[PDB]
Ligand binder design. Structure first.
Ligand code: 42O
Ligand code: 42O
Lengths: 229, 229
């Protein structure tokens, strides 16, 4: 990822320091009155929300390299009250106060375009995710998440496509319908737990029920989309 | 909105003329290889997708003033295959090719920050609606749709809070489960349909089953929010 490495070197040049985090750590949480811009350089995270009675809802997953913002770039108001939690064993992130960001981007348009693009990818990603929900219900959503996991962590092997993630991360990613659906897929040999990993066979089935996410990845990450097609 | 008028002027300074469109026109369509930046200024539109078997998925609805983009500003490549379709009677929209946009934003960052912040509102908007549907099901959706109508088109009346839309537009966007929900909201007199118009008289019930959208209106459109609170 060329833009990402360039954005790292730009942040470090401007004196911004990389912070290590550990699983279950919160890079920011939903009560913080400091709005941040997080450049997640390495790791896997989830955006969660905590409702008033304390039940946790998982909203979105992110992966390095990527930008996540808790405030609006001009106002430096919260965009929404959320937590960003680390779910891989480690993660590396550059934490930037919102207003510092405005300055950093103002003085370099290339980086500004890059950050802007990361927003565009979230917007196109949620359109595609809503599309596949609209057609195939939860089946759209499970397949969609399995498909991206495969494109991003799948190693072609005679065994199929191995999803290269130690199990703890897979458990952090994953009800009635679910069990019955995840059932159906195992039953149908789309995925297999063999040799202690998931291995994916019917990539075509994933693509069928999550078509828009297939397209979205093709446009967003073409080089990666090519390696399994 | 202030930022909205000023970007309209900047666009006309740089020679972008408003193009008028009428109900059911495609502002752009998915096969068009030209990536665009649509600044919807007035009217209502919807983004749609066309799955292969030909069914038209409604993905999102938009209201002037707002920004819709069909290419990534950095690589200038397609963000997806979409159609942008008018559903109001007429709408005012400035259509800018993606390369010309990038130049316009590059020479005035104020406007760059406005467009950037517009996509940020779009990101958290869809997370908020998703939080509400995951927590409260269709009651969360329905209560979200009506909350939306209320803030944007809610004109306070003795009869309560009227929804100021020609009732063919209403009728353009609007099942078994749905009717059980509206059946109840009509019975408990949270909404009243009289004189062929919707009215709202318990704003606080809606805020209960859609607390993330309510919270989103507050952080992203405080002016609108505060008017009704
Ligand atoms: O990392 C990237 O540049 C690409 C392009 S934008 C994106 C996303 C979208 C949230 C913005 C995701 C999210 C995602 C989807 C499905 C499974 C995931 C598993 C782990 C982490 C994130 C996941 C993933 C992703 O790779 N990308
Ligand atoms: O609001 C819009 O103009 C579109 C059309 S109705 C909708 C929703 C639904 C709650 C009513 C959402 C939220 C949402 C629900 C279910 C699955 C989702 C999957 C991904 C993202 C959001 C999801 C978002 C949204 O944009 N819209």
């Amino acid at each position: 990822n060329a833009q990402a490495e360039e954005f790292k070197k730009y942040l470090e040049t401007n004196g911004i320091k990389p912070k290590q985090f550990h699983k279950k750590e919160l890079i920011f949480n939903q009560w913080d009155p400091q709005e941040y811009c997080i450049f997640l350089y390495d790791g896997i995270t989830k955006l969660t929300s905590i409702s008033e009675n304390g039940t946790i809802m998982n909203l979105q997953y992110y992966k390095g390299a990527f930008v996540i913002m808790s405030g609006f770039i001009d106002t430096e108001t919260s965009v929404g009250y959320y937590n960003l939690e680390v779910i891989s064993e480690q993660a590396t992130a550059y934490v930037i106060k919102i207003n510092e960001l405005k300055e950093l981007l103002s003085k370099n348009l290339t980086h500004f375009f890059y950050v802007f693009q990361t927003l565009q990818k979230q917007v196109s990603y949620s359109l595609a995710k809503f599309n596949d929900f609209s057609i195939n219900g939860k089946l759209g959503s499970i397949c969609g998440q399995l498909l991206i996991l495969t494109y991003v962590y799948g190693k072609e092997t005679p065994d199929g496509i191995k999803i290269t993630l130690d199990n703890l991360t897979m458990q952090e990613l994953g009800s009635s319908a679910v069990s019955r659906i995840i059932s159906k897929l195992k039953q149908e040999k789309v995925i297999v737990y063999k040799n202690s990993c998931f291995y994916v066979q019917n990539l075509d089935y994933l693509k069928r029920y999550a078509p828009k996410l297939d397209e979205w990845f093709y446009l967003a990450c073409p080089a990666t989309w090519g390696k399994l097609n």
